[PDB]
Design an enzyme around this catalytic site. Structure first.
Site, PDB file in Angstrom:
ATOM      1  N   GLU A 108      -4.502  -9.217   0.678  1.00 23.10           N
ATOM      2  CA  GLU A 108      -3.857  -8.169  -0.073  1.00 23.10           C
ATOM      3  C   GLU A 108      -4.420  -7.158  -0.733  1.00 23.10           C
ATOM      4  O   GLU A 108      -4.676  -5.766  -1.819  1.00 23.10           O
ATOM      5  CB  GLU A 108      -3.435  -8.932  -1.204  1.00 23.10           C
ATOM      6  CG  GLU A 108      -1.910  -9.964  -0.824  1.00 23.10           C
ATOM      7  CD  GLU A 108      -1.183  -9.029  -1.061  1.00 23.10           C
ATOM      8  OE1 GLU A 108      -0.746  -7.978  -1.285  1.00 23.10           O
ATOM      9  OE2 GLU A 108      -0.219  -9.093  -0.744  1.00 23.10           O
ATOM     10  N   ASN A 159       3.796   0.341  -8.063  1.00 25.05           N
ATOM     11  CA  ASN A 159       5.090   0.863  -6.775  1.00 25.05           C
ATOM     12  C   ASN A 159       5.768   1.740  -7.137  1.00 25.05           C
ATOM     13  O   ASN A 159       5.298   2.089  -7.935  1.00 25.05           O
ATOM     14  CB  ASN A 159       5.490  -0.467  -6.701  1.00 25.05           C
ATOM     15  CG  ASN A 159       4.631  -1.877  -6.083  1.00 25.05           C
ATOM     16  OD1 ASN A 159       4.470  -2.464  -7.353  1.00 25.05           O
ATOM     17  ND2 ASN A 159       3.391  -1.450  -5.077  1.00 25.05           N
ATOM     18  N   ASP A 204       8.543   1.509  -7.819  1.00 29.14           N
ATOM     19  CA  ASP A 204       9.583   0.892  -9.467  1.00 29.14           C
ATOM     20  C   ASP A 204       8.840   1.348 -10.577  1.00 29.14           C
ATOM     21  O   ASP A 204       9.277   1.086 -11.805  1.00 29.14           O
ATOM     22  CB  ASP A 204      10.082  -0.030  -9.299  1.00 29.14           C
ATOM     23  CG  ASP A 204       8.951  -1.400  -9.296  1.00 29.14           C
ATOM     24  OD1 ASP A 204       7.750  -1.326  -9.493  1.00 29.14           O
ATOM     25  OD2 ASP A 204       9.704  -2.735  -9.189  1.00 29.14           O
ATOM     26  N   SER A 230       6.380  -0.533 -11.034  1.00 26.89           N
ATOM     27  CA  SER A 230       4.822  -1.496 -11.094  1.00 26.89           C
ATOM     28  C   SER A 230       3.700  -1.371 -10.732  1.00 26.89           C
ATOM     29  O   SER A 230       4.187  -0.328  -9.973  1.00 26.89           O
ATOM     30  CB  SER A 230       5.816  -2.662 -11.277  1.00 26.89           C
ATOM     31  OG  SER A 230       5.825  -2.666  -9.730  1.00 26.89           O
ATOM     32  N   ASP A 264       0.348  -3.578  -8.574  1.00 34.73           N
ATOM     33  CA  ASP A 264       0.344  -5.330  -8.261  1.00 34.73           C
ATOM     34  C   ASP A 264      -1.140  -4.704  -8.525  1.00 34.73           C
ATOM     35  O   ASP A 264      -2.366  -3.924  -8.602  1.00 34.73           O
ATOM     36  CB  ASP A 264       0.373  -5.056  -6.802  1.00 34.73           C
ATOM     37  CG  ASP A 264       1.387  -4.825  -6.699  1.00 34.73           C
ATOM     38  OD1 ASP A 264       2.180  -5.641  -7.259  1.00 34.73           O
ATOM     39  OD2 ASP A 264       1.840  -4.888  -5.269  1.00 34.73           O
ATOM     40  N   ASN A 283       2.166  -8.986  -9.332  1.00 34.44           N
ATOM     41  CA  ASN A 283       3.102  -8.218  -9.363  1.00 34.44           C
ATOM     42  C   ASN A 283       3.134  -8.018 -11.395  1.00 34.44           C
ATOM     43  O   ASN A 283       3.635  -8.853 -11.769  1.00 34.44           O
ATOM     44  CB  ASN A 283       3.891  -7.464  -8.934  1.00 34.44           C
ATOM     45  CG  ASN A 283       5.304  -6.963  -9.765  1.00 34.44           C
ATOM     46  OD1 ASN A 283       4.515  -5.539  -8.709  1.00 34.44           O
ATOM     47  ND2 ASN A 283       6.163  -6.176 -10.305  1.00 34.44           N
TER      48      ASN A 283
END
Ligand SMILES: [Cl-]
Length: 129
Positions: free
Chosen positions: A35, A46, A48, A50, A52, A59
């Site tokens: 990650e 991301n 959308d 959002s 991370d 998220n």
């Protein structure tokens, strides 16, 4: 901060992740490697809208508040910036909530595509634990 492999394993063990909900320590070290490359300051946006955050890429649509993710929850009740600290406490505590949500460690796409079904004990081999 960028952790070493065994240094993060030991920190995760001390914060109670080893066999948490049945996931051995190697699963958590493998997820953090893929990650965030073991970097607490990792961020990634991301499609959308959002973002991370941190060593386990938690998220902002569901888990933390970053002030710029409309309609998001904040299920862990923390600013997303707290997940970037050199102290991983807040990331661990929020990860225990995520892994208890029903889908286990399949919530982490890198774990499901790069760690699930592999010899994850390799990630803790050699370490003084
Ligand atoms: Cl992946």
């Amino acid at each position: 901060k960028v952790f070493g492999r065994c240094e993060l394993a030991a920190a995760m063990k001390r914060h109670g992740l080893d066999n948490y909900r049945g996931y051995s320590l190697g699963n958590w070290v493998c997820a953090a490697k893929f990650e965030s490359n073991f970097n607490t300051q990792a961020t990634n946006r991301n499609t959308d809208g959002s973002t991370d955050y941190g060593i386990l890429q938690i998220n902002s649509r569901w888990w933390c508040n970053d002030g710029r993710t409309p309609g998001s929850r904040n299920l862990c009740n923390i600013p997303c910036s707290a997940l970037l600290s050199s102290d991983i406490t807040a990331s661990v505590n929020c990860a225990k909530k995520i892994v208890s949500d029903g889908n286990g460690m399949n919530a982490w796409v890198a774990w499901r595509n790069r760690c699930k079904g592999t010899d994850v004990q390799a990630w803790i081999r050699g370490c003084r634990l």
